[PDB]
Amino acid sequence: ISYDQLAKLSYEKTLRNLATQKVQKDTKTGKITIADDDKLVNKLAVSLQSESKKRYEARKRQMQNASFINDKNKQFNEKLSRE
């Protein structure tokens, strides 16, 4: 799977996470003030943190699963064994 597909497929996913539940320009300054809902941005912030948190804890679990000497080697032998 390429990063082309994995992007669109992850795009499709977070659209399902959405599916759960004005422009004003001063052309002299060039400042395009898009006044939008402050509640929705907060809902993005919390959701995005939660998504990253979910992933963060996902590694933590997978790190705590278990012919080596030190932390790295064990994993390096695991990088060899997967092949």
Partner: protein, 211 residues
């Protein structure tokens, strides 16, 4: 006592050698030898080549294989290394088969402990020294803090001494921004956001002060 090396391969010793081989590989025979207090480099390497290496085989020969062997003997007279290679076996074993066809613990535990210690210690002295200095440095820092904190409790405010800057252009990063590469100029307006973040920052500082 110092002495001339040799003897016989105790199973523990063999295991140790195997471990070493896994660690250091098949061409650093000195180090592996060193790991074994009894056995030499040459001895070790020979052993690995002859007995210990897993990509050898000691399974019995099929009738066809027997034929191949004895035929080789008939044709290549006692050039047993060559013969071994032809067979695809180690040579001593082949020879033995051919012949057949024709008719204390404290010390050991010491080296073990030492061995395991070594194998689980895989850094040059520079590394070890560096980590030592790091932990020492940390300790020093905490001691300094304890003094400073103690004085604060006592009522004397002491600012923490800077790191004695190594060179003229050495940087303290809390003075001012590291190399403020600013964001790309604003297409969408950013003013309210700037304010809010500023407030958040100042608030955080306040919290820290109170903390």
């Amino acid at each position: 006592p110092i002495y001339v090396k040799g003897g016989v391969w105790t199973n523990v010793e063999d295991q140790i050698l195997k471990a070493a081989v896994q660690k250091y590989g098949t061409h650093q025979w000195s180090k592996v030898a060193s790991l074994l207090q009894k056995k030499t480099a040459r001895q070790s390497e020979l052993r690995w080549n002859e007995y210990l290496n897993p990509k050898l085989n000691f399974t019995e020969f099929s009738k066809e294989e027997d034929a191949q062997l004895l035929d080789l003997a008939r044709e290549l007279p006692n050039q047993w290394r060559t013969i071994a290679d032809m067979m695809a076996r180690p040579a001593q074993v082949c020879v033995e088969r051919y012949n057949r066809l024709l008719e204390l613990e404290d010390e050991e535990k010491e080296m073990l402990a030492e061995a395991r210690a070594r194998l689980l210690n895989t850094q040059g002295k520079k590394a070890t020294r560096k980590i030592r200095e790091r932990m020492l440095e940390e300790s020093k820092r905490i001691a300094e803090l304890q003094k400073r904190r103690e004085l604060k409790q006592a009522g004397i405010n002491v600012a923490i001494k800077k790191p004695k800057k190594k060179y003229g252009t050495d940087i303290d990063y809390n003075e001012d921004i590291v190399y403020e590469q600013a964001p790309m100029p604003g297409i969408y307006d950013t003013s309210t956001e700037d304010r809010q973040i500023k407030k958040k920052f100042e608030q955080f500082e306040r919290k820290v002060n109170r903390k």
